[PDB]
Design a protein around this ligand. Structure first.
Ligand SMILES: *CCC(=O)N1CN(C(=O)CC*)CN(C(=O)CC*)C1
Lengths: 14, 322
């Protein structure tokens, strides 16, 4: 899954 | 002697309270700044005991204009450049947009909020380039208005950058900003590259600022941003009858103190108006909307338009459309 800051959740791009 | 204009404060609070209710949201904030003086004209939390003006969030698409300005300054692109925006991999990670375009102009990159386009600009420049530009527009700098939790956001002092980190930074992720910080970014856009401190006390204009970016490049990108609030742009719901506006709308997910994401969205719109000769910078943030819409363009763009239109009328700004 995503994590901050190394693998962020990005609008419009899973 | 406070800079807040109580007329603007009252219409900001009214519209923000209505939008928070309509979206069944936890909360919202709005900050309105004079792009010539740095004066805070309105600054509201809804509900009024939820102190969210200083909450941090990943600024997302609101940084993309800064990526275009930096690419133009460095000569990676020219004003009429066309980017190849076909989805591709960075270190195995698929880079894609909401809608696939094979190619976009720089205006298209903002209109369509192209992650593919901005990633290619980012990876054509040293990792230091966007770190310098964002810093020039005040990201990672304190705001100093005297509010609880105020501080300086979450800004990287990073020695080592993977390709995917360089790309996500160009998308506005892996750093956090406050609403005040982002409003100051958009005030620096509205002045065409003059950085000024925020003030909650009155000042007499003109206010000398720091030249942090060339006027020609900032004005180029302000005109490109106008597309975002026109049909086929991500911020069309923010459009105001009679006015040109320069905005970006975006979305983040809320980060816990473990740096893990939870399924709460943060919807925002940042902008200046009127785009022909900017007067105001506005940031609207809607936290944890729960009425089936989550993204900036759906949740926060309408209230940006309602507030900015109300400000432009109240302040007797001449319509600049057509
Ligand atoms: C960890 C790699 C990374 O930073 N990204 C991939 N990604 C996910 O793993 C989901 C959390 C989203 N990112 C994108 O750049 C999507 C286009 C960031």
């Amino acid at each position: 899954a995503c994590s901050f800051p190394k693998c962020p959740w990005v609008e419009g791009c899973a | 002697p406070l800079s807040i204009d109580e007329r603007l404060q009252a219409l900001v609070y009214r519209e923000l309270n209505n939008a928070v209710a309509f979206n069944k949201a936890e909360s919202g904030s709005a900050v309105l700044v004079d792009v010539n003086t740095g004066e805070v004209l309105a600054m509201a939390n809804s509900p009024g005991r939820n102190r969210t003006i200083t909450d941090v969030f990943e600024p997302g698409s609101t940084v993309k204009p800064m990526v275009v300005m930096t690419a133009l300054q460095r000569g990676v692109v020219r004003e009429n450049s066309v980017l190849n925006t076909i989805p591709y991999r960075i270190n195995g990670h698929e880079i894609k947009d909401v809608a696939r375009y094979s190619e976009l102009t720089l205006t298209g990159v903002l209109q369509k909020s192209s992650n593919v386009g901005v990633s290619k600009l980012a990876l054509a420049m040293p990792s230091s380039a966007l770190v310098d530009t964002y810093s020039r527009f005040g990201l990672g700098k304190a705001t100093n208005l005297g509010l609880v939790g105020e501080r300086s956001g979450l800004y990287p002092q990073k020695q080592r950058w993977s390709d995917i980190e360089r790309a996500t930074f160009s998308f506005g992720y892996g750093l956090m900003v406050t609403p005040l910080q982002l409003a100051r970014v958009y005030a620096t856009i509205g002045s065409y590259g003059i950085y000024r401190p925020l003030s909650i006390t009155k000042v007499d204009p003109p206010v000398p600022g720091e030249r942090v970016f060339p006027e020609s490049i900032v004005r180029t990108v302000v005109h490109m941003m106008e597309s975002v609030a026109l049909p086929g742009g991500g911020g069309v719901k923010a459009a105001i009858k009679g006015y040109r506006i320069a905005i970006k709308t975006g979305t983040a997910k809320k980060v816990g103190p473990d740096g893990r994401y939870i399924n709460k969205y943060i919807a925002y719109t940042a902008g200046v108006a009127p785009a022909s000769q900017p007067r105001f910078a506005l940031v609207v943030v809607i936290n944890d909307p729960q009425a089936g819409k989550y993204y900036g363009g759906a949740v926060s763009a309408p209230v940006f338009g309602a507030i900015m239109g109300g400000v432009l009328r109240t302040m007797n700004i001449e319509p600049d459309a057509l």
